[PDB]
Symmetry: C3
């Protein structure tokens, strides 16, 4: 499992959300941050190792303008995940 | 150490905090985030290897309702933790 | 690559930014968070493996007061980084 974190230009949030939803990705978490400043949006989603490359590609293509300030996507390893509703624990 | 990250329903924060305090945790970081919008709370706490699973389970039990939208808890490895007050590691 | 995450007293942000800038690190992400509450600032910066320890030390020295509430620095491994502007993987 991977945590995919992207810092994007705020106007690109709708396109990024759209791209992820088409991939069938659920549980997008979004926050407003300051980018060094200019307002940025941080998007975060946890995905299977099987899905992370498609997720990264989808975010990159949706968030891209080619101009300065486009931002970054960081992928981090998740060792364990628990579904709070059921208490069930998953690992890959 | 491990970074325990949970995305919970905002009204569950008090119960989650109470459970963590009972474990002797106390130090934790809370962010206001948006789920998909629905308001959510992101709780982040770095915990020793000896206690991380107990922290996960404490958060799970406290944040649980059995309803849709309860959220998830993620565990990530921390390679190095520094206490800013003293500069000590891990 | 490493993700350096620091939770600091808000008034220390400028000093931390100055230290990072002197190291040639201008790109960083700042969030307003709640620390258990008191307002805190989360600084996130992805840095190369060869520089992360120098970065951690620089942040610690700039953010330190020696008093309670100074905060924490966590270092996490980054599995992959992509530059959105070009689509290139680090
Ligand atoms: N190394 C980094 N660590 C953390 N956040 C970063 C980092 N680099 C960039 N960011 C975030 O991304 C936002 C946009 O910066 P970006 O990645 O586009 O860098 P840049 O200096 O504009 O270079 P370029 O756009 O040409 O790649 C920043 O304001 C910051 O919020
Ligand atoms: N284990 C932790 N996990 C996540 N965030 C933490 C943790 N410990 C501290 N923090 C964050 O750092 C902020 C400052 O707390 P700090 O680390 O200074 O702890 P403290 O109890 O004041 O101890 P001391 O300052 O003596 O080290 C907290 O309010 C919280 O946002
Ligand atoms: N895979 C995921 N990655 C990151 N955050 C998630 C994920 N799934 C759910 N969330 C967050 O948790 C909230 C409730 O999710 P859930 O209870 O799992 O439907 C959502 O609104 C998201 O903000």
């Amino acid at each position: 499992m991977k945590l995919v974190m992207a810092i994007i230009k705020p106007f690109k949030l709708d396109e990024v959300r759209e791209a992820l939803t088409s991939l069938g990705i659920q549980g997008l978490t979004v926050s407003e941050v300051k980018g060094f400043f200019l307002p940025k949006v941080k998007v975060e989603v946890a995905v299977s190792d099987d899905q992370y490359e498609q997720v990264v590609e989808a975010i990159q293509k949706a968030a891209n303008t080619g101009r300065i300030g486009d931002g970054k996507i960081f992928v981090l390893d998740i060792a364990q995940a628990v579904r709070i509703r059921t208490g069930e624990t998953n690992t890959e």
